[PDB]
Structure 1
Amino acid sequence: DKNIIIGAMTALITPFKNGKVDEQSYARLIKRQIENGIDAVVPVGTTGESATLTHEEHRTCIEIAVETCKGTKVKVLAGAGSNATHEAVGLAKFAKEHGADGILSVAPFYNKPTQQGLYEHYKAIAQSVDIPVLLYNVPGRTGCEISTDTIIKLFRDCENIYGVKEASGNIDKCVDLLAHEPRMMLISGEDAINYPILSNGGKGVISVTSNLLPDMISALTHFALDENYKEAKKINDELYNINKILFCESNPIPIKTAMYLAGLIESLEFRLPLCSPSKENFAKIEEVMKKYKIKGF
């Protein structure tokens, strides 16, 4: 079998304080995930503003997550993607030496590689490290789609590519993947449809919502894995509202905003071109939050 990283996972926000990553806060937030039943954390993914972080800042976040998760079952699945293969290989290698348990590698954004290019991109990445590699398909952001065929071919040709984080709002593709390759780990990258993905044999979530509600996302995931579909569906339905409003502006603007409103972070800072939401959206976010029980530290 392949080595895998599954279960309830959080795409960690990266808190800033006067432009700099807030390291005490970051560690404090990770610890809060762990104490609320989360199985893995993802430093410096999309939700962690990877695009505007430096290479050094990636290292710092990965190291903090690794350190914090040390001596626990919680794994670190490090964001380590790029639209340049040489960069992506480099980032994977670095994540590996910093002690990450695996990497999440987003499909090349902006330059629209062909399916053949995608295949070689990921093959190079997978052959550069010996840790699990999770594909990440989010065509709304990247402008390309890793086809089911390409995903399956990568799973079958590269030993450490074990699955895909799917953020495409396409349940038909999920059926397709698991009908043809049942050894695949399909991971939900879309909070609103966590349950439908899990009930079709998906094996985890990489969640934005779990930043704010780690206990509910882990319970949902664990219920689903336990084949308690009733309880998992109940949680998924009650979370629908917040799962949508967290995208009323581009992620992670709403989640960071909500984290701040909840007193989980000290200051609401983004790195350009991300910025504070409109005062209207700030209100919409504050409105939905107050309808949920939020765990402190």
Structure 2
Amino acid sequence: THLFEGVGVALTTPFTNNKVNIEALKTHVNFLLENNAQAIIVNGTTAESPTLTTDEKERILKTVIDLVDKRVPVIAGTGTNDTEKSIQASIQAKALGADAIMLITPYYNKTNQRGLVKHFEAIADAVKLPVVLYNVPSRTNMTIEPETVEILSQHPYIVALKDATNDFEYLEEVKKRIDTNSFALYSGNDDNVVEYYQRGGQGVISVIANVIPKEFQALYDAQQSGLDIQDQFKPIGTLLSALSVDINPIPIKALTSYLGFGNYELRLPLVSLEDTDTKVLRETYDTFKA
């Protein structure tokens, strides 16, 4: 009934001399599927969607869809801070074959809670496809209030929340206003997953699972089977700490490129880490693997 449970990956965009590299894109997705990724979130923040052209987003999304071939859900990031364009982009994602769309709250312009509902509901009504809300106040400086999540969760087509508030008071206020049989809560912050899972989350939409999908999903599966993951998490948390050297996806792409998925490139206004930080992060990764 939920789109997925466990680890979905906020897929990075592989660039090669500033161009989307479709062959690397396919290799990365294959690597994700072979390593137990439960879902692919395409053109999210981690994909640098703000600097992707529309053509790029569509070429990437169609590629992911045709390659995945329904083996896991393909969730297209289509929401912006403009309702009309979010509607257009969601409709194209539907037509290309996406299984769901992800919609962030507005940002920069922002809105009030009543506007927020109008915005999400307008997109959901127009697309008629499963929608994953995305709340990340550290990027948007607004939130989807718990009462607002309740109103929205009653939309037939709004099925989940990517919750990147890192606020467990908020998590508990949301829990008591939704039915998790029909409305899934996904962490949007890799390092809160131990507690996020303990408190009954349905999984995570993950940045680090770009490079360690198997281990990160295995951690979910252990929790779900009735095992304690508090200590088992630590070696991943060690890598997560090194990943926090800069704003995502600046650090994760040092690691995706290291594994062969595109060059280590970010599109402006983002920039790659400097050499020292890049080698430190890559070493940390090799130590995790060892």
TM-score range, shorter chain: over 0.9
Matched AA of 1:69: V
SS at match of 2:251: helix
Calculate the TM-score normalised by the size of structure 1. 0.92
Mapping 1:1-297, distance limit 5 Å: 4-72=3-71, 74-156=72-154, 158-183=155-180, 184-226=183-225, 228-230=226-228, 232-261=229-258, 263-293=259-289
Cα distance in 1 for partners of 2:227, 2:76 equals 30
* CA apart distance, 1:243: 1.7
Structure 2 unaligned residues grouped into runs of 5+: none
Task: Say whether the 8 Å CA contact 1:10–1:40 is kept in structure 2.
Answer: yes
Task: Say whether the 8 Å CA contact 2:21–2:262 is kept in structure 1.
Answer: no
Cα distance in 1 for partners of 2:204, 2:233 equals 12
* CA apart distance, 1:86: 0.4
* CA apart distance, 1:5: 3.6
Task: Say whether the 8 Å CA contact 1:3–1:132 is kept in structure 2.
Answer: no
Q: 1:108 to 1:51 in 2, by over 3 A?
A: same
Task: Say whether the 8 Å CA contact 2:256–2:262 is kept in structure 1.
Answer: no
Cα distance in 2 for partners of 1:266, 1:166 equals 29
Matched AA of 1:30: V
Task: Say what the alpha-carbon RMSD is for the aligned residues.
Answer: 1.5
* CA apart distance, 1:244: 2.7
SS at match of 1:127: helix
SS at match of 2:86: helix
List 4+ stretches of structure 1 deviating above 4 A: none
Q: 1:170 to 1:58 in 2, by over 3 A?
A: same
SS at match of 1:93: helix
Task: Say whether the 8 Å CA contact 1:81–1:106 is kept in structure 2.
Answer: yes
Cα distance in 1 for partners of 2:43, 2:150 equals 26
Cα distance in 2 for partners of 1:116, 1:181 equals 19
% same residue:
32
Task: Say whether the 8 Å CA contact 1:47–1:251 is kept in structure 2.
Answer: yes
SS at match of 2:200: coil
- For each residue in 1:41-90, what CA deviation from the matched residue of structure 2 results, as whole angstroms up to 9, or x when unmatched? 01110000000001111111111111111052x11011111000001111
